[PDB]
Amino acid sequence: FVEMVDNLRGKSGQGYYVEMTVGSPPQTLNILVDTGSSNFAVGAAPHPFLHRYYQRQLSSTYRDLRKGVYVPYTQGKWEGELGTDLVSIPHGPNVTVRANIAAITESDKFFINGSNWEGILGLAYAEIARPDDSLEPFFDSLVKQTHVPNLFSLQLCGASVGGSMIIGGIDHSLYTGSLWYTPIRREWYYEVIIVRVEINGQDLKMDCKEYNYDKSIVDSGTTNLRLPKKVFEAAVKSIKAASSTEKFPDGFWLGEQLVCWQTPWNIFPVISLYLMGEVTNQSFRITILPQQYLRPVDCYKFAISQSSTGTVMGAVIMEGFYVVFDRARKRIGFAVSACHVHDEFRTAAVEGPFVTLDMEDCGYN
Template identity: 35%
Template sequence: MTITFNVVLIIFQILLVLRYGEGYNLFGEAGQAYSIEIYIGRPIQKLNVIVDTGSTTLAIASYPRREHDKYFETNNSTTFEDSGMQIQAKYSQGNWVGRLVSDVVEIPSLSLPQVRANMAIITKSYKFFVNGSGWQGLLGLAYLPVGAWGDHVIVESWMDSLDARLQRPTSFELNLCGPQSVTNVTHYGNLRVLDIYSEIVSDIIFRTPILHKRWYEVGVLSIRVLTNKTEELIVNKNITTDAQNFEVDMCRKLNHQKSIVDSGTTNIRLPDALFRQVVDQLKKVVQVANTQYPSNIILDNFWDHAEAACWPEPQQWSLPWLAIDLLSAESDYQYYTLEIPPQNYMRVASAHNSSGESGTVSEFCYKLGLEAGGQETVLGYTAMEGFELLFNRSAGWIGFKTSDCGPKTRITGPYNVTHSITSSCQLITPKTDMAISIKAAQWALCVISIVAATVLIYLLAPCIKMLLVKPLPRSTQISMSQTALVDQDIT
């Protein structure tokens, strides 16, 4: 019995190594998103692109930059096709302009056929490429309405091209693991593309609906600081029986503009007032708890996301966990909670372990993984590390489960409330997608054309009448209209 168990355990460990050891296909440095290697053109050119659920377009640098001299050389690809049409894109940080082109694209770490896909070759950019970044563009995985734009141009995504090539819809899974150790700033992860008819696993029991198929918009109901696990369980129990305990005001503020899951963003971005509220609570808990890392060491500039905090040794944080409540896809009266440890939001910014070198000192620096975001809410990869996320694009939901790699996260729930969450949090405000917007614009143009034609006919009617109708002898009757009076004065 013991031998059998040990054999099974060894096999399980080997499988984990195969999947999460040598099987990593996502990499990134501190403060940068996760990137993947792709092949473009023939002969192939190997490039690295960010895996970005916050945009749609495959966009590649086509010129050498100060940040990096590697780029896609269009003249060296025999399969390159240039439409000549100008397109552009603007992000929360930076923008670019370029041209719409197409070429053969392949991702070697995925068991997928090569596809001819639309992409943008970036010819000019502003604050888009990060200094020292090891990537040359990004692979957008969101829906069509948030792609690059131009005059009379629709840029099809790589995912849409793949679906057309396979003749069936696909989904994808992101497993972001973070750094492998406290002394290493390089983070690792995995991207898998799944056939929704055969490969979607059944153990994804926590699902949240995609409210609008543009970005991956979800219902973020609240973000809380877990000061005491036992107390939080009691509060959650109360919430299941009393909907009035649910913080509707916070929920509405979080989703006022939009709440999205964005792997291309580093931090958890909150509306300004809520950012201040959460950070102030974190600071207060640190002061009251009197941990081994006193609050006077972590200066206010750190909490305001202005400066990094550094120590001579890597830190094992005993700070509070954060809880993120998400609307459940199972019921409009149900939600569940993602619980993330301080290792997620106390991000490693740099790690220099130079112990033993004469005249040098080790330094480990951290930055806060929370930031103010104006009016929008963004769950960046800080909120995703330690979870496996399954993006079912066609069915319109995102599944969550805890990961076998990365921070030790938790998922609790589901919790029930007595009133509609989408209604009380105002998550059902109509938002038009591109197809609806185009149709609405067409109808609006039609109505405007009809109105304009009616007005024109009305104005031209007297002239047409004069041309078609034989003039009658002038009457001696005096008209009471101002126009007639003027006419009579002139005569």
């Protein structure tokens, strides 16, 4: 799968993109890779921020669906016209498929000024597609029309970022140790269940329901580890305590201020999420280093932040790990990334099995 290794580019805070082609003849575009949504959408008009855009008039294979589509994210909304056309990933599998494409014709605080991407690839399930679940998501179309296995994996490497999207398989060269899998609780977002949390090794004795209210998801289109309220205060409480030996401003834990050195790494704790495992009463844990939740912006940004719609395991989480979206078996795999920025002293980690009871009662119903 070395054809696909290192096919992801980006800039810190601006997402990860892959090169795609649309229409005949092929128009090359950079497309943000987003496991947190299920629309395939590309700029189709000359918005001043865009390096390029989809020009339907140039395409033999374009077909109008004569439906409008609207999509608001956490922030950012766009509106568009649905169509289908032929699509390829040059540094991906050797195929071409007909896919739904939203030609973005109006947007609001969506495109990033200074970014080098022109669209977004929603990789999650139909259930959350707009206007509705009859709009077959890209990856569903990819699997139905080719012999590409129903699986993709992400090694997000973390001012320029790099990484790999392996479509249809796994590249064992992108990780060390063993993959550990957690069930996809439901096929809409990539929903999982967190069952326990630990800073430097200390539990938080919270009802595990507080971790998955109203959901926990794996989202590559989100930068931060985003915890619910209770959970966020508790974890800074614990990190501020473990790291107290150097005084840090309040702006820095709000993610406003910066720290600058010429970096006492082991001043800072590891953070640990236990995930529901494959077997009744068995879990595993994933552990991130300071080198993960501290975003280089020799200065650093605290990258854990409060949330509101559930836990979101964003690039802060995913940059420590190789993440396998095993859609065929309703599960997501985590393994230590071979590219994660580590340490002579420490590493990010994933280990098990652990015994943890009542893992069902952990997710909101």
